[PDB]
């Protein structure tokens, strides 16, 4: 892009796509912070079977991914890429975007996340048998939350998470690069304008998101090997398309 007016238009446009595609409004999440699972409800979650809690989490991830697909669809540049590259970007990026969007549902004051109508701590997911992954996700959401990420910042940051020209498989790499660089300009322009450039150094390191995605795939492979019929019969087709 040439001149601040085109960069600023991009900023507004990305922010709007984000707002239209966020699954939950931020104030609905904040208004729920006192609604916390009782110890008896926690125990109830801990006693659920591994396979049932996997299914539930997969369903919830699938719904979050659907909103990310709509996000990508509303970024003009994205829909200008060829279909192969759309899919490449979404298969590598969708989970990473959800993982970023989850910080909004995380309360750093008590280390809880909004899940199925109330806030609960990481002990809520014990039945999954992936304590390392869960703990890493909670830690990631705590990092971002410490930054006090604004809605506008999440918009712009998650547009960049998705439009990543380093994804293996991209055919029009140069085109993705151009889009990535215009979105980087937009993000950094907005940071500069809002006096928020101090967060650049505090953003999680490159590959952190990749590490969570790969743990997620690795824990999935173990679960699937234990319960292959559950995955086939009861995991969402989109989920399996992105991760199996």
């Amino acid at each position: 892009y040439a001149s601040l007016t085109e960069i600023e238009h991009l900023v507004q446009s990305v922010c709007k796509s984000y707002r239209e595609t966020c699954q939950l409004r931020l104030e609905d999440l904040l208004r729920q912070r006192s609604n916390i699972f009782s110890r008896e409800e926690v125990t109830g979650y801990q006693r659920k079977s591994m396979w049932e809690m996997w299914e539930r989490c997969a369903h919830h991830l699938t719904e979050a991914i659907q909103y990310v697909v709509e996000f990508a669809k509303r970024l003009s540049g994205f829909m200008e890429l060829c279909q192969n590259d759309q899919i490449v970007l979404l298969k590598a990026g969708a989970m990473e975007v959800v993982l970023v969007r989850m910080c909004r549902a995380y309360n750093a004051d008590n280390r809880t996340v909004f899940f199925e109508g109330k806030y609960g701590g990481m002990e809520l997911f014990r039945a999954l048998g992936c304590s390392e992954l869960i703990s890493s996700i909670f830690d990631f959401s705590h990092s971002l939350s410490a930054l006090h990420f604004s809605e506008d910042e999440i918009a712009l940051y998650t547009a960049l998470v998705l439009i990543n020209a380093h994804r293996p498989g991209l055919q029009e790499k140069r085109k993705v690069e151009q889009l990535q660089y215009n979105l980087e300009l937009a993000f950094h322009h907005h940071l500069c304008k809002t006096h928020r450039q101090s967060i650049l150094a505090k953003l999680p390191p490159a590959g952190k998101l990749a590490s969570l995605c790969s743990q997620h795939v690795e824990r999935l492979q173990i679960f699937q090997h234990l319960h292959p019929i559950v995955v086939q019969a009861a995991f969402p087709p989109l989920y399996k398309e992105l991760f199996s």
Binding site: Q66, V69, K73, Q83, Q86, I87, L90, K91, P237, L238, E241, L242
Partner: peptide
């Protein structure tokens, strides 16, 4: 497949 349908609709 599902992605291709979500991107097309």
């Amino acid at each position: 497949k599902i992605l291709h349908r979500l991107l097309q609709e």
